[PDB]
Amino acid sequence: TCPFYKKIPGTGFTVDAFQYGVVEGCTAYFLTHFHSDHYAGLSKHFTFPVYCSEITGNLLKNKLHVQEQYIHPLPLDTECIVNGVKVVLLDANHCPGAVMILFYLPNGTVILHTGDFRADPSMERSLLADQKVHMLYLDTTYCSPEYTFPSQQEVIRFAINTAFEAVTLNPHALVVCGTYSIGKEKVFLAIADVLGSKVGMSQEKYKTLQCLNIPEINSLITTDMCSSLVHLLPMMQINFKGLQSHLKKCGGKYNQILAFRPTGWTHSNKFTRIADVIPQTKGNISIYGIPYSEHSSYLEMKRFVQWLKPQKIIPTVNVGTWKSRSTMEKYFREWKLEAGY
Ligand code: NI
Numbered sequence: 001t002c003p004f005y006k007k008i009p010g011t012g013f014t015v016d017a018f019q020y021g022v023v024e025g026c027t028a029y030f031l032t033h034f035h036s037d038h039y040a041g042l043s044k045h046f047t048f049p050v051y052c053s054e055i056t057g058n059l060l061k062n063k064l065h066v067q068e069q070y071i072h073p074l075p076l077d078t079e080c081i082v083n084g085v086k087v088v089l090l091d092a093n094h095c096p097g098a099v100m101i102l103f104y105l106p107n108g109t110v111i112l113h114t115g116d117f118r119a120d121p122s123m124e125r126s127l128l129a130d131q132k133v134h135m136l137y138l139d140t141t142y143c144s145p146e147y148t149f150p151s152q153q154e155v156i157r158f159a160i161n162t163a164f165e166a167v168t169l170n171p172h173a174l175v176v177c178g179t180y181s182i183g184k185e186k187v188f189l190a191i192a193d194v195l196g197s198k199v200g201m202s203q204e205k206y207k208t209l210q211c212l213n214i215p216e217i218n219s220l221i222t223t224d225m226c227s228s229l230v231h232l233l234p235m236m237q238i239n240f241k242g243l244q245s246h247l248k249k250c251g252g253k254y255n256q257i258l259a260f261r262p263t264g265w266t267h268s269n270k271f272t273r274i275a276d277v278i279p280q281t282k283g284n285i286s287i288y289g290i291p292y293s294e295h296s297s298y299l300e301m302k303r304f305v306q307w308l309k310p311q312k313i314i315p316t317v318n319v320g321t322w323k324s325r326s327t328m329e330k331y332f333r334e335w336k337l338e339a340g341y
Helices: 054-062 121-125 152-169 185-195 203-210 240-249 298-308 322-339
Strands: 013-015 028-030 050-052 071-073 080-082 085-091 099-104 110-113 135-138 173-179 230-234 256-262 280-282 285-290 312-315
Touching: 050 054, 054 071, 121 298, 135 298, 152 173, 152 185, 152 256, 152 285, 173 185, 173 240, 185 230, 185 256, 230 240, 240 256, 240 285, 298 322, 312 322
Parallel strands: 013 028, 028 050, 050 071, 110 135, 135 312, 173 230, 173 256, 256 285
Antiparallel strands: 080 085, 085 099, 099 110, 280 285
């Protein structure tokens, strides 16, 4: 059945709750972003109002064929009324089109649902600065102190410098980058920009990218693989077997592959700096796992919450085990005692 952490008290609303059938008493279904664990259940047969960003609404129409009459896109950073309740959508610094949702309940309670987010100090100067938030529905993906990672900027600097060196030493090397969802487009776009190439990809992935309102996108991507030396493949093909196979398909144009897997966290992070990352190599194939995250590190999460000072926190991730739930609640109490709220 629908879990309680997907329901907004005092409303008829749910968040990211499309796989439970008709949720009893739900008048408006919000969708924070277009990732499959959150949209699971939507299709052309859905007939309830879906509230989302413009970008998510483009993907619902074009990829899932949801009918236009049930898609209700909202502008960001704008007070809107939905079924009699004031709401605001804020940028979540996750994947394209991802939002956090502020609800202003008729009784005076204010609720923030982060969806999936990567906390940032820039959020301290949005419309969140303007009033008190009482309850926080928090993306707790990496809520433990072992989870450190570098800035996105440091990671992209590493990737650009690595790719440019490799291709300048060998102009017959191909760069491959893995993907299995939207998000992390900076990785492949930044590498293609330094190399003077478009990114080549499947027709399905090109269609998906054309929904994202990215500026000058026609100049950066293509379905013509032959004209490109940065290729995007499914994450599943980013291994020695899959890469050897792909190289065969390129008809002797290339004699080496340098491949990137933008993972979330991996335990080489507790020891190793970004400067010190090395690939796995077999023959003329090298694979780099780079820690490009679109979720908060532990320290980023803690800073956001200690700034916001909510009265009550409701985790939305890692909620399935008692040991995880108890660990998270211990951190919440530490943060509150350190900060004095
Ligand atoms: Ni997500």
